[PDB]
């Protein structure tokens, strides 16, 4: 996990187009017609982790190995969803514990453009200031979504610094990043916020919420995976 067959080129509003297939765990969650409503991350061949607010159902599909959603010829994997596991602790009012697991009906076929992201340990500590990366097909301007997968490098923020803006709206299962000239935006939800752990890209956050206009000077908020990974492991073990 966490090691793309195709290396990404570094250096979402104000982000940059990604190298095709360089974020192999990134999936597009679409409805039965092919409409992209959220992103997600493959954690293995049978499971995808996304945000609870995305409201995924078994009628939706997981599209893996995609880069250009505007390309009808591009080879991808349209995977059916067998069951949806929404974290029962998801708070629809505070948005805390914003995570959902999707169990695929048919396993994804891993390859050069399709693989898993690593999961952190509940005790992992990704220091504030650490430069991480988020990806997705969300808006690039606050409008239709970009056809090609976007990416952006951004710093993790300390809870104290994040609260300087969001105050008490920041809960224990949330981690902030951004306010650095880039911003996740409509369509990016459920997607990954990854940071390197011993060189391997590890899922530190799941795009959740933030500025209602995707302001690049405001902290973006993500579901804190370290606070939710035990729930993840437990769900996989029981299913």
């Amino acid at each position: 996990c966490g090691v793309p067959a195709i290396q990404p080129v570094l250096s979402i509003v104000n982000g940059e187009e990604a190298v095709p297939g360089s974020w192999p765990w990134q999936v597009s969650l679409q409805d039965k017609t092919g409409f992209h409503f959220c992103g997600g991350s493959l954690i293995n061949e049978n499971w995808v982790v996304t945000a609870a607010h995305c409201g995924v159902t078994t009628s939706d599909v997981v599209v893996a190995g995609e880069f250009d959603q505007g390309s009808s010829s591009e080879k991808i994997q349209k995977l059916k969803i067998a069951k949806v596991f929404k974290n029962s602790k998801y708070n629809s009012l505070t948005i805390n514990n914003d995570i959902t697991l999707l169990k695929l009906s048919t396993a994804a076929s891993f390859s050069q453009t399709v693989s898993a992201v690593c999961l952190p340990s509940a005790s992992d500590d990704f220091a504030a200031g650490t430069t991480c990366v988020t990806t997705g097909w969300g808006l690039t301007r606050y409008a239709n979504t970009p056809d090609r997968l976007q990416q952006a490098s951004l710093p993790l923020l300390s809870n104290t610094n994040c609260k300087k803006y969001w105050g008490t709206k920041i809960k224990d299962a949330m981690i902030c990043a951004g306010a650095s000239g880039v911003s996740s935006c409509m369509g990016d939800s459920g997607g990954p916020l990854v940071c390197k752990k011993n060189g391997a890209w590890t899922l530190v956050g799941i795009v959740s919420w933030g500025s209602s206009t995707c302001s690049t000077s405001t902290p973006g908020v993500y579901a804190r995976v370290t606070a939710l990974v035990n729930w993840v492991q437990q769900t996989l073990a029981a299913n």
């Binding site: 992209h36 409503f37 607010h53 995305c54 409201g55 948005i95 979504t145 933030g210 209602s212 995707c214």
Partner: protein, 58 residues
């Protein structure tokens, strides 16, 4: 009809791109809009039918 039917559509702070319907009193019909996934106001429906049955004529 409920006054919430006269409120403009509310996307919210979450970053999803979910299609929902809202009643547009100016036109007299329910139209589609993008909902962010959380904190939906009441003029937000999963189908045009639900929207028209709740806000039609407002």
């Amino acid at each position: 009809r409920p006054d919430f039917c006269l409120e403009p559509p509310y996307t919210g702070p979450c970053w999803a791109r979910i299609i929902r319907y809202f009643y547009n009193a100016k036109a007299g019909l329910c139209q589609t809009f993008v909902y962010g996934g959380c904190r939906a106001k009441r003029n937000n429906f999963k189908s045009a039918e639900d929207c028209l049955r709740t806000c039609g004529g407002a």
